[PDB]
Structure formats: structure tokens, C-alpha cells
Design a protein around this ligand. Structure first.
Ligand SMILES: [Zn+2]
Lengths: 167, 34, 109, 456, 166
């Protein structure tokens, strides 16, 4: 995140920036070296493993943001000719197969309740009860129970979202 | 001066989308509901 | 499918080698076929002479020759021209004819 | 006498002839009297009864050979010379030769050439094969090509063939194989749309003594500097000939104004007293440069609101601020600090920028991701010169013609090169063997690592 | 399950036609590869256009908008705009469809049709409508896992030598 204290004199700000740069370099290098150790195979402890996991998570997220901004700067790496080539290949294959596009699920679909039940069961399966579930997980369990209770209203919500939601 | 890097990327995205739409217009059996 | 660039000064001999194993006889037959193509009254008599030369076998190659008679002859002459003056002479003689001019344009690009 | 009538000429096939490698007998390894069989493309020892070429002819029925050193054909086993004008292209590809009118008209060629196979290309815009780790050398050599004066000098073997060299001198392999490679690249009637730098890189590794190998990739700037210095030294015959082609083309002169800082941890009285010492006063150590070293500003270390893209950017003129008589760089050697000013004095016709990306911090090598925002078609370096030199200098507007870019991490890096094709004005991106067409406006969006500009 | 898949693959390899005969210079080739960075390098505009072919336009738009959302760790957060998120419930479907397109690129429409059989009577995992069709092409077997491709070619001497020369 951007760090700029308006009232800090610029020489002190420069010194702090140099400090942060040096510490960041050491942080990155030590995280990488420790991960090489752990991966290659060395005896370590839970605290070190967890701290290294945190550091690696932060570094990976930084790299991913770099990737996204580089994409936005360099535009699509796939040229228009390549795009049209693959698109034409796909349409030719689908025409050959004689494929019929999947329609938007009708209002009175025969199996919609079956599909909803399967989805809710799959969502429930992800709870190997440890007796300690956080707020969001317990809330999702409550929502799943509500959908189980009143299938049709949940279907109406789902279709509404699929038709309009984009944010 | 400066460069608005995002603008050239957006232009290229729009060019690709326009060409793909050009191609897609020929394809017929597509489905869409109101 | 045959293209003017495909034909070089020894394309005819290379083709004759697919029926005649001996290099000397292949060269002799190639020269005789080139002479037949050059001094030919018309297509039917030229094809008759070619079959008289190469037997009833090789008829596929004879068909190719008859289908592209002038093209092969002039392309081989141009590619085998030893002297620059000779090369220019054949180039002008070809340019004198549209079809041959088409062949020349295809050869260059 | 039977010459001009060899019946085996049709046997040749130009799809196997590859004259891009060492010319030695494939059985005895000797360099003496090498003949290449034109039916299979292999080299044997030359001619005569019981020789390898003769025995190969009578064994395989391959009856046409070419003297690799004389450019004369022969038909074995009954060895008589062959004379046929349709064979001239093989000899030309084996040993390209450029006439003066050709080198004069080399740049004004707006029509694509076509190789023996159905591949169109343009002379100079030709890919270089990629041995395991070679891309840096490929890019550097491609950039060195496209320099009309140096290219024209090296396209004529007579220019550098007669100069002297001490007995145990291996540093002339570089110059002669570079001439060979330049001629191969600018050959307008190749058999293929790509060339192999194998021989040049073997000479490079040999002369560098395992520095700049081909199984490991080194620094592009280090390779360029070493190559230019080696070429200058090798072309300087049995001495340091003060003016070679490299010096004539690339080398300029700068004026360095070094001022030794008195000391950081001293009282003000002593610090200002030391000014009269003259040791901490500005000097003039005017010297010469093959290439300018531009230093990017340090990355912002924090994103900002404007240019929301996390990628920073600088104008070209901000980093060219250095090399004017005002700015002061801060050199720091042990126990000593210097304030260095710079002032360009002699500008070369082809100017090289070597923007410093990779820097070793306390722990590892980091690549500066800043992008230089520069114009391509016009830049005036008039201001960065002293008024004492501006009068001498008439033309000072430069145009970018070559740009070497590095991509990826410092370890798993790769190199590509944007080259302007003269004659036309089209910009082509060469990666080791791929030739893409890059629009003029997209060159400035890359991490320009090295650049070559032409003075007009 | 994967063990049964391995068993079927082995049986198919063994049951190809004179697959083990190497007297005339034939040679078999097993290729295995991984489609590097498949999930990360998935252009979203192209993905949307591809999806619109098979599924409703609104459904495709919804899926693309879903893939284009904001990621957020404890304190960091960025906007994902290049690759798929892989944590959605339909990421499996998206990945399999993109892999089908990649399969068409690798195989070619003609050979893909030969393998998949006519639309009326599709073939099984490793099977062709006829042994002549089986032998018509160098590629004899193909199988894409989620992102891992296995291919089995059988070249004759002339084909192998021509490929090597190229
Ligand atoms: Zn041989």
C-alpha cells in the first residue's frame, strides 16, 4: 500500500525508505533460502514452517499483481489472427459434431430440484465437523439449510443472479 | 510527457473483441434469451 | 499443380531417371524429349511422338508433359541457358507471348 | 572435354547442402583438400586415387564433388572438371561475395528475397539458431549487424585479410569468422531463411577462455564490451592502431570532472579548509567511451495514485541529464566519496546506450523494472555538449535503429532485439529464430537494455 | 478411476495392430506433457467468446464476470483480469472446455473426428470404427487428463526418417 506521511521531513523520509529497502531485500532472500532448505529436505519446526508460508504467500501475491499489471500494459498476448484461428477451429469442430448450444435453464425445468439438492449436498460435504467453525462458514451452513428448506425461492434467486448480476 | 499504458492495452483488447465479433456474426446457431 | 519455379535445368532428366536407371540413357532421352517438345507441329502429334519414344509405360509423365508442354520446354531452356546473352534472348522470346510472360512472372515472383 | 556434359548433374539436391560448419574430412579430420559431395552433403579429403572422396564416389555412386577451397566442381571417379552455369548458386552460398555496387545498394532493397525453399525474407533480417544458451550472443551480433559502416567494412574480406598478426594469435579468428557471419547473414540468395552462429560462438568461447560459453548465458552488456574491445585489438596490427573501424564508428570522447569529497564525518571547518588543499578539487580526466552507461532511477518502492499501473517510468531526457555539465553523480569507493560530473566532447556517428538494469544488492541480483519512455525518430543531444564543441558538431539529431531488450528474471532471462529495416522503415522483433513484425509505437513499452542510434 | 484408466491404456497399447513388430524398422513413441501455465494463461475475452458457442450468452457473460473479480489476502488485494480463479464451482467445466480446444489444436479436426467417430455412433475411450482408420495416421492413441496429455504414435521407417530430416 502507499506510505506517505505528509509531515515527515524529506531527508528522514529518504533514510526510512533506504532502511525499508534493505530490510525488504534481506526478507526476500532469507525467505527464498529457507524455502529451499525446507523443500530440499531439512529438519524444521512448526513456527518456522508457518512463518515461511506467510512470507511466501506475500511474495507470491506481489508477483501475481506484477503479472496482472504487466498484462494490462502489454495487452492480450494472443494476436487477433491467432484468436480467429482458434475460434474458427472451435466452430468447425462444433458444427461437425452437430452440437446444440446449452439453453438457459427454463422456469419449469424437470430436474432443477434434483440439481439444487446435489449442489447443496456437495456444499455440505465440505464440513468435516471439528465443532469450531468460523462465522462465514457457519453462515454458509445456515444458508444451505435455508435453501434445503425452500428450494423454489433459492432457484428464483439463482436465476435472477445468473441473468443480471455482474459485480 | 507520460504514457497512459492502460489505453493501448484497452485499444488492443477492443480490436481483438471487434474481430472476434466480426467472425461470430457468421456463426448462426447460437442461443441467447432476453 | 506444376509451377515454373519447380522446373530447373535438370528437372526433365530427374523425371526420366524414375524409369531409366542409367544416367547416360536418361540424358539421351531427356535431350530427345526436349527436341520433340521444341520441334512439334501440334499437341496430338507431339504426344504421339512422346509415347513412341517412352513406350506405353511412363504415360503419367507423358500426360504431364502434354498438359504443360510449352511451360516445361521454355522453363528448362531458360534455366539451362549457359550464357547471359542466351538467357536474355530466351527471356525476350518468352515475353513475346502472354502465356510465356505469365510463366516468366511466376518464375520471378 | 566431357565437362559441360556431365550426366550426373541431376543427382545434386540442394536440400542437404549445409555449409555453415567446420570444413574438415569426415573420416580423417584433416583440413587439407576438402571436397564436399553434392549428392549427400558430406565432406571428404580431396581427389586422387585411394582418397576418401574417390572411394566414397565408387562406393555410394555419388559422382559430383566441389572443392570447398577452390570453388571448382569435379566428377569422380574419372576426375574431370565440371563447368555449368546453373551451379553458380551453390558456390555463391558457399562463399558469398559482395561487389561495391552491391554494398552501396544494400540498404535500398524494398523487395523480399526468396530462399531455395519457399521462404521469403529480407537480407539482414534473418534468424540465428539457438544452441542451448546463446540468445544473448544472437541479440548482440544482430545489433552489431545493421550498422552500415561496420557491416560494409566486414562484407569485404580484402579489407582486413592483409593485416599482420603475431605468430600465436588466436584473436583473429574473431574478426575473420565475424566477416564470414556478416556475409552469410546479408547473403541475398540463401538456401534457407536462417543461419547458424556455431562457428562464431566457438571462436568466441575459445578467445574468451570459457567466458561467454554457449551452454550458459552471460550478460549482454559484458559480451558487447568484450567483443568490441577484442575486435579493436585484433584489427590493431602488431600494435594499438589508434583508429580501427570500431573506433571510427562507435568510440566517442567524454570529459570527466571528478571532485574528491573531503570526508563525510569531519567538522565543517576542516571540510571547507580542505577545499584549498586542491586534492578535493575538480579535475579533468578526459577519456574515451565505446558506449554510454545510463543509470535508471531506483524503483519507487511504493505504488502511487497516478499511473495506477505498478510499473514506474522515466523520460529519456531525465536519465540523459547526467552527461551534462550540471548534474553530479555520487561515486563511493572504500574510505572515499567522489562527485563526478560528465561532459560529452566527441559524439560518434553511431551511439550506444547501455542502460543498467541488473544491480547486485547486499544479497542478490535485482532487475530494475523501470521502463524508459523515449521517442524513436528524433532526439537532439546538442545541449549535453559544451559550447566549445557545439560549434565543431554540425549534425546532432539521432534516431534509434537497434534496441536489445531483456525479459524474465535475472536467472531465467531471455533476449530479443527490435531492429529497424532500412530501405523500408519497418520494425522487426527478432527472437533467437522467430521474426515478428513490431509496430513502431510498441518499442518504447519494453525494458530497453541496450540501444544503438544513428546520427543522420 | 485412475488405476482403471492406466489398465485400459496398457490394454489398448498392447491391442494395437502388430504394435510390437519391429522387423521393417517401425518405431513407437509415447509422449507425455503438461500444458504449462494452462490455468494462469487463459484470456478472458477469448474465453467468453468460446463459451458463447456452447452455452447461453448470459451464462457465458456471468462466468467471465465471475472470473474477473478482486482477490484479497489478509491485507493485500488485487484485481484478477488475466487468468481463471480455479476456486469457483464451474472452474472444472471451464478448464475441460479450454482443454478440448487445445486438443483440437494438437490433433487437428480430421484426426479428432476420426478418433471421436461419427456423431451417430461415437467410439469408446481407445477404439476406432475400423482398423484401416486406426492405421490411417501416425497418432494412434490420445488422452488428456485435466492438464496432462499422453499421446502414442507409431511411425514407419520412411515417416520417421522424413520427420527426423525435417
Ligand atoms: Zn555420399
Amino acid at each position: 500500500i502507499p506510505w506517505k506521511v505528509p509531515g515527515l521531513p524529506t531527508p528522514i523520509e529518504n533514510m526510512i525508505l533506504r532502511y525499508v529497502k534493505a530490510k525488504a531485500d534481506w526478507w526476500t532472500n532469507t525467505a527464498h533460502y529457507n524455502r529451499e532448505r525446507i523443500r530440499r529436505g531439512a529438519t524444521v519446526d512448526k513456527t518456522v514452517c508457518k512463518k515461511n508460508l506467510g512470507r511466501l504467500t506475500r511474495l507470491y501475491l506481489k508477483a501475481e499483481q506484477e503479472r496482472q499489471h504487466n498484462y494490462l500494459k502489454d495487452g492480450p498476448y494472443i494476436t487477433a489472427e491467432e484468436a480467429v484461428a482458434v475460434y474458427t477451429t472451435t466452430v468447425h469442430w462444433l458444427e461437425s459434431r452437430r452440437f446444440s448450444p446449452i439453453p438457459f435453464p427454463p422456469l419449469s425445468y424437470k430436474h432443477d430440484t434434483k440439481l439444487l439438492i446435489l449442489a447443496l449436498e456437495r456444499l455440505k460435504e465440505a464440513y468435516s465437523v471439528k465443532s469450531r467453525l468460523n462465522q462465514s462458514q457457519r453462515e454458509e451452513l445456515g444458508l444451505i439449510e435455508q435453501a434445503y428448506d425452500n428450494p423454489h425461492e433459492a432457484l428464483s434467486r439463482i436465476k435472477r443472479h445468473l441473468l443480471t448480476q455482474r459485480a | 510527457g507520460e504514457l497512459d499504458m492502460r489505453k493501448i492495452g484497452q485499444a488492443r483488447n477492443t480490436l481483438m473483441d471487434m474481430r472476434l465479433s466480426q467472425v461470430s456474426d457468421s456463426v448462426s446457431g447460437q442461443t441467447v434469451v432476453d | 499443380d506444376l509451377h515454373p519455379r519447380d522446373i530447373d535445368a535438370f528437372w526433365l532428366q530427374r523425371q526420366l531417371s524414375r524409369f531409366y536407371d542409367d544416367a547416360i540413357v536418361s540424358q539421351k532421352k531427356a535431350d530427345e524429349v526436349l527436341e520433340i517438345l521444341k520441334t512439334a507441329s501440334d499437341d496430338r502429334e507431339c504426344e504421339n511422338q512422346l509415347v513412341l519414344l517412352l513406350g506405353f509405360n511412363t504415360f503419367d509423365f507423358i500426360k504431364v508433359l502434354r498438359q504443360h508442354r510449352m511451360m516445361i520446354l521454355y522453363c528448362t531452356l531458360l534455366a539451362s541457358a549457359q550464357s547471359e546473352a542466351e538467357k536474355e534472348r530466351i527471356m525476350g522470346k518468352m515475353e513475346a507471348d502472354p502465356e510465356l510472360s505469365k510463366f516468366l512472372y511466376q518464375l520471378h515472383e | 572435354r566431357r565437362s559441360r556434359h556431365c550426366p550426373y548433374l541431376d543427382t545434386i539436391n540442394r536440400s542437404v547442402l549445409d555449409f555453415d560448419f567446420e570444413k574438415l574430412c569426415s573420416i580423417s579430420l584433416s583440413h587439407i583438400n576438402a571436397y564436399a559431395c553434392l549428392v549427400c552433403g558430406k565432406y571428404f579429403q580431396g581427389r586422387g586415387l585411394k582418397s576418401h572422396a574417390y572411394i566414397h564416389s565408387v562406393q555410394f555412386s555419388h559422382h559430383v564433388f566441389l572443392n570447398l577451397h577452390t570453388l571448382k566442381f569435379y566428377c569422380l571417379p574419372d576426375n574431370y572438371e565440371i563447368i555449368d552455369s546453373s551451379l553458380e548458386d551453390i558456390t555463391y552460398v558457399l562463399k558469398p561475395t559482395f561487389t561495391k555496387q552491391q554494398i552501396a545498394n544494400l540498404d535500398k532493397q524494398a523487395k523480399l528475397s526468396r530462399a531455395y525453399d519457399g521462404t521469403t525474407y529480407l537480407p539482414g533480417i534473418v534468424g540465428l539458431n539457438n544452441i542451448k544458451a546463446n540468445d544473448y550472443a544472437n541479440a548482440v551480433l544482430q545489433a552489431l549487424s545493421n550498422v552500415p559502416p561496420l557491416r560494409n567494412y566486414f562484407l569485404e574480406e580484402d579489407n582486413y585479410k592483409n593485416i599482420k598478426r603475431p605468430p600465436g594469435d588466436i584473436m583473429f579468428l574473431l574478426v575473420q569468422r565475424f566477416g564470414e557471419l556478416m556475409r552469410k547473414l546479408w547473403n541475398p540468395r540463401n538456401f534457407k531463411a536462417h543461419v547458424s552462429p556455431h562457428e562464431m560462438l566457438q571462436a568466441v568461447v575459445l578467445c574468451s577462455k570459457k567466458t561467454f560459453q554457449i551452454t550458459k548465458q552471460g550478460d549482454g552488456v559484458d559480451f558487447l564490451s568484450w567483443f568490441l574491445n577484442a575486435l579493436h585489438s585484433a584489427l590493431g596490427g602488431t600494435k594499438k592502431k589508434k583508429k580501427t573501424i570500431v573506433t571510427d564508428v562507435f568510440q566517442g570522447s567524454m570529459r570527466i570532472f571528478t571532485k574528491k569529497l573531503p570526508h563525510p564525518d569531519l567538522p565543517a571547518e576542516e571540510k571547507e579548509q580542505l577545499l584549498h588543499n586542491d586534492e578535493y578539487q575538480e579535475t579533468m580526466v578526459e577519456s574515451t567511451f565505446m558506449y554510454l552507461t545510463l543509470d535508471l532511477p531506483t524503483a519507487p518502492l511504493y505504488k502511487d495514485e497516478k499511473e495506477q499501473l505498478i510499473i514506474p517510468q522515466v523520460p529519456l531526457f531525465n536519465i540523459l541529464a547526467k552527461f551534462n555539465g550540471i548534474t553530479e553523480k555520487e561515486y563511493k569507493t572504500y574510505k572515499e566519496n567522489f562527485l563526478k560530473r560528465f561532459q560529452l566532447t566527441k559524439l560518434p556517428p553511431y551511439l550506444i546506450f547501455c542502460i543498467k538494469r541488473f544491480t547486485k544488492n547486499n544479497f542478490f541480483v535485482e532487475k530494475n523494472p523501470t521502463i524508459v519512455n523515449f521517442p524513436i525518430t528524433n532526439v537532439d543531444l546538442r545541449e549535453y555538449l559544451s559550447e566549445e564543441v557545439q560549434a565543431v558538431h554540425k549534425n546532432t539529431t539521432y534516431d534509434l535503429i537497434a534496441n536489445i531488450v531483456h525479459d524474465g528474471k535475472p536467472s531465467e532471462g531471455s533476449y530479443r532485439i527490435h531492429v529497424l529495416h532500412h530501405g523500408t522503415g519497418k520494425w522487426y522483433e527478432l527472437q533467437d529464430l522467430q521474426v515478428t513484425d513490431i509496430l513502431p509505437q510498441m518499442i518504447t513499452l519494453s525494458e530497453a537494455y541496450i540501444q544503438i542510434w544513428k546520427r543522420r | 478411476p485412475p488405476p482403471l484408466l492406466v489398465y485400459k491404456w496398457c490394454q489398448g497399447i498392447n491391442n494395437l495392430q502388430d504394435v510390437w513388430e519391429t522387423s521393417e524398422g517401425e518405431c513407437n513413441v509415447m509422449l507425455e506433457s503438461r500444458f504449462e501455465k494452462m490455468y494462469e494463461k487463459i484470456d478472458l475475452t477469448l474465453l467468453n467468446r468460446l463459451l458463447r458457442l456452447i452455452v447461453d450468452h448470459n451464462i457465458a457473460d456471468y462466468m467471465t464476470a465471475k472470473n474477473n473479480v478482486v482477490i484479497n489476502y489478509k491485507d493485500m488485494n488485487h484485481t484478477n483480469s488475466y487468468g481463471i480463479i480455479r476456486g469457483l464451482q464451474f472452474a472444472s467445466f471451464i478448464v475441460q472446455y479450454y482443454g478440448l480446444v487445445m486438443d483440437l489444436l494438437v490433433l487437428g479436426l480430421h484426426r479428432a473426428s476420426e478418433m471421436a467417430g461419427p456423431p451417430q455412433m461415437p467410439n469408446d475411450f481407445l477404439s476406432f470404427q475400423d482398423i484401416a482408420t486406426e492405421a490411417a495416421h501416425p497418432i494412434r492413441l490420445f488422452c488428456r487428463y485435466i492438464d496432462r496429455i499422453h499421446i502414442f504414435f507409431r511411425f514407419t521407417a520412411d515417416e520417421a526418417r522424413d520427420l527426423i530430416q525435417r
